[PDB]
Structure 1
Amino acid sequence: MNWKEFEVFCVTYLNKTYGNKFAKKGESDSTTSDILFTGNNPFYIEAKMPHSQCGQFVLIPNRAEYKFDYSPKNKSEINPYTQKIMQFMSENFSEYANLSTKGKIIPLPESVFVNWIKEYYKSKSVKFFITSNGDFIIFPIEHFEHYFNVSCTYRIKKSGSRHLNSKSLPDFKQALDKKGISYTMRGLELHSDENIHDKRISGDDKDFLIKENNGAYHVKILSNTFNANVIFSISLKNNISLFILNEDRKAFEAAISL
C-alpha cells in the first residue's frame, strides 16, 4: 500500500481498538499534524511506514564565512542537536557546500539525530508514533531509538507545486497549444481524450504538471526553488525489544485514559 492508505490503516486500527477518539480530518498545519487523539489528554499520533523520512530543516551555505546559516524561514527553532549538525557541517564546510540532489550523509552519532527527532516532535505535541511490521506498533516519542534506525543527509530538495490559477491560465492554454495537445478547459480543470497523466509541459518560465483526477485533469505549476535541507531518514528495526514494546503499549493506554 502507499503511505496515504497506510495512514488510513493506522487511524482505522486506533479507532476500532481504543474507541472513536482519533481524528484525521480537516486542514493540517505547516508542521507535523497527523492523527489527533481528541480526549482529555490530547496529543498528535505520527504515523510512519517502515521506511520513511522524519523531519528536516533548510541550511543556506555561507561561502564568505564557510559556515551554514539556519534559514530564517524554517518552521522549527534551533535546538542543541540542530547546532551540533550545523557545527559539524560548518567545520567541514568544503565537503557540504557543493549541493547535490543525491545528498551527502552526516556521520554524527545516531543519538544526535534521535534527539533532534525527539525535540522536534515533542515541540509539535507529537507524543506517540504508530507503525507496522505486520502488527501495529505504538510507542512514545521518548523511546524512539528502540524502534527506528536513523540516518541524516544534506540534499537539494526542490520545493513543491501549486495549483494552476486564473493568472496562469492563458500561459497554460498556450503551452498546450505549442505541444499539440487536444483539450478543452472547464474553468481550471483540464479535459482531454489524450493520455496525459503525469505529463510535463513548459511555457513562459512555468513548468506545468498534469494529473488525472476523477473525470478531469488537474494542473499544477512546479517550483523553481532548489534549496538544500538536512533531512532525517528512518528504518524500522527488525530486532525490537518485546519488553520495551509491551511497556510502551501500556504507556499509550495510560495516555489515552488520563
Structure 2
Amino acid sequence: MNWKEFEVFCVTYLNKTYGNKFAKKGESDSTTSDILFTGNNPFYIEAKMPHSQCGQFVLIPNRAEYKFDYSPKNKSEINPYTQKIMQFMSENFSEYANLSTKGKIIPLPESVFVNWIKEYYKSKSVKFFITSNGDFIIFPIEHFEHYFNVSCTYRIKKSGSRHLNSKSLPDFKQALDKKGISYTMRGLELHSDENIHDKRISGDDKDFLIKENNGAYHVKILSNTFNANVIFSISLKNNISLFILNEDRKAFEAAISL
C-alpha cells in the first residue's frame, strides 16, 4: 500500500473508532498537517508510515563567509536546534559545500534531530501522531523519541513539477515527433494508442513527463531548481514498551473527550 492509501486508512480508523470528527486535508498539500480533529479543542494529527521522512529546510552555501545561510524563502522559522545543525555543517564547510544527490550524513547526536522535529510539528499545532505496526499507534508529540529512530542528511532535492501550459504546448509537440510517437491533442489532453506512461521527453530547455489518468494522458513540466536541504528520516522502533503505549492512548482519548 502506498502512502496515500495509508493516510486514508488512518482517517477511516479514527472516524469508526472515535466518531466522524476527523477531517483529512490534501495529500501533497505542503501548508498544513494531515488530519484535523474538528472537536471542541481542535488540533492536528500527523500520519506517518513506519519508514518516512520528517521535514526539512533549505540551506544555501555562502562561499564568501564559508558558512551556510538559512534560505529566506523557507517556511519554518529558526529554532535553537536548527542553528546547532547549521553551526556543525559550517565548521565542516569544505565537505558539505559540495552538494550531492546521494547526500552527506550529519553525524550529530540523535537528541538534536528529535528536538527539531518536536519544535517543527508543534509549530503546525500537531499534538498527536498516528502510525501502524500492524495495529494503529497513536502517541503525543511529547513522546516522539520513544517510537522513532531519527536520521538526518543534507542533499539536493529537485523541486516539483507543474502542469503543461498553453505557452509550452508548441514545444512539447516538437519533441514528440522527434521521438516518433503518433498522437492527437484535444486542448491540453493527450491521446495515443501507444503507451507512453512515465515517458520522459526533453528539448528546448523544458523537460516533460507524461502521466496516465482518467483513461487519457496528462503532461507535466519538470523543474529546474536543484537546491539542497537538510532532511530528516524516521523508522519505527520494532519493540515498543506496552507501558508507554497504553498511557499515550489514554492521553489521546482524554484529549478528544475534552
Contact 1:201 1:209 survives alignment (8 Å): yes
1:49 is displaced (CA, Å) by 0.4
> How far does residue 64 in structure 1 lie from its aligned partner after superposition?
1.1
| Aligned equivalents of 2:227, 2:9: Cα separation in 1 | 33
Q: Is the Cα contact below 8 Å between 1:147 and 1:237 reproduced in 2? A: yes
Structure 1: which 4+ aligned runs deviate by more than 6 Å? Answer: none
CA distance, structure 1, for counterparts of residue 246 and residue 32 of structure 2:
26
Distance 1:99 1:26, change over 3 A: closer
CA contact (8 A) 1:31 1:124 kept: no
Cα distance per residue 1:3-40 (max 9 Å; x no partner): 00111111111100010011114687533421111111
- Give CA deviations for 1:132-187 in whole Å, capped at 9, x if unaligned: 01010001111100000001000010110000011111111212122211111121
Native 8 Å contact 1:24 1:34 kept in 2: yes
The range that moved more, 207-216 or 177-186, is 177-186
Change (3 A) 1:234 1:257: same
Deviations 1:98-151 (A, max 9, x none): 110000111111011000000000001111110001010001111100000001
Q: Secondary structure at the match of 2:158?
A: coil
Change beyond 3 A, Cα 1:199–1:133? same
* 1:61-91 per-position Cα deviation (integer Å, ceiling 9, x unaligned): 1111111000000000000000000000001
What residue in structure 2 maps to residue 126 of structure 1? 126
8 Å Cα contact 1:28-1:34 kept in structure 2: no
Distance 1:31 1:220, change over 3 A: same
Decide whether aligned partners of structure 1 residues 88 and 25 sit closer, same or farther in structure 2, where only a CA change above 3 A counts.
closer
Distance 1:27 1:65 in 2: 40
| % identity of equivalent residues | 100
The worse-fitting range, judged by mean Cα deviation, of 233-242 and 25-34 is 25-34
In 2: Cα distance, 1:38 partner to 1:189 partner: 38
**Secondary structure, in 3 states, of the residue corresponding to 2:160?**
coil
Shift in CA distance, 158/133, structure 1 to aligned 2, threshold 3 Å = same
Residue pair 1:99, 1:228 contacting (<8 A) in 2 also: yes
Instruction: Give the SS at the match of 1:150.
Output: strand
Pick closer, same or farther for the CA change 1:157–1:238 going to 2, 3 Å: same
* Separation of aligned partners in 2, 1:140 and 1:27: 22
The RMSD of aligned alpha carbons is: 1.2
Distance 1:28 1:255, change over 3 A: farther
Matched-pair contact (CA < 8 Å) for 1:129–1:141 = yes
Matches within 5 A, 1:1-150: 1-25=1-25, 30-150=30-150
Query: Structure 1 residues 89, 26: CA separation in 2 closer, same or farther (over 3 Å shift)?
Result: closer
Residues 166-218 of structure 1: CA deviation (Å, up to 9, x unaligned): 11111112121222111111211111111100000012100000011021111
Bigger CA drift: 33-42 or 73-82?
Answer: 33-42
Q: Which runs of 5+ in 1 are unaligned?
A: none
8 Å contact from structure 1 (residues 196, 210) kept in 2 = yes
d(CA) in 1 for partners of 2:46 and 2:27?
Answer: 15
SS of aligned partner of 1:233: strand
